[PDB]
């Protein structure tokens, strides 16, 4: 259905077995995204901290 894919498509062994990939145009890795750690509400008895 398409002649070429130009996208953030990761070079993987299972894909390379059925399609061709150029050498990498971008280096990367899996990472963790978290919601930021906002400031906590001061707890009762936080005067002992």
């Amino acid at each position: 259905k398409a002649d070429i894919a130009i996208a953030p498509l990761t070079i993987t062994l299972v894909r390379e077995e059925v399609i061709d990939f150029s050498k990498p145009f971008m280096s990367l890795g899996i990472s963790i995204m978290i919601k930021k750690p906002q400031k906590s509400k001061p707890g009762v008895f936080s005067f002992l901290d």
Partner: protein
């Protein structure tokens, strides 16, 4: 925005994105060479920035 997310820790792996073509495509060699030309001339870093 809203700047409420954050990347935490190092990357879990190392890999790369590649331009993909159907197995045996006529475009495979020219597009592999072009990616290397754009890599070597610093175009890929300018575009990420």
């Amino acid at each position: 925005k809203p700047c409420d997310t954050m990347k935490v820790g190092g990357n879990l792996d190392s890999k790369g994105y590649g331009i993909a073509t159907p197995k045996g495509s006529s475009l495979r060699t020219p597009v592999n060479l072009a990616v290397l030309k754009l890599s070597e001339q610093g175009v890929l870093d300018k575009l990420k920035n």
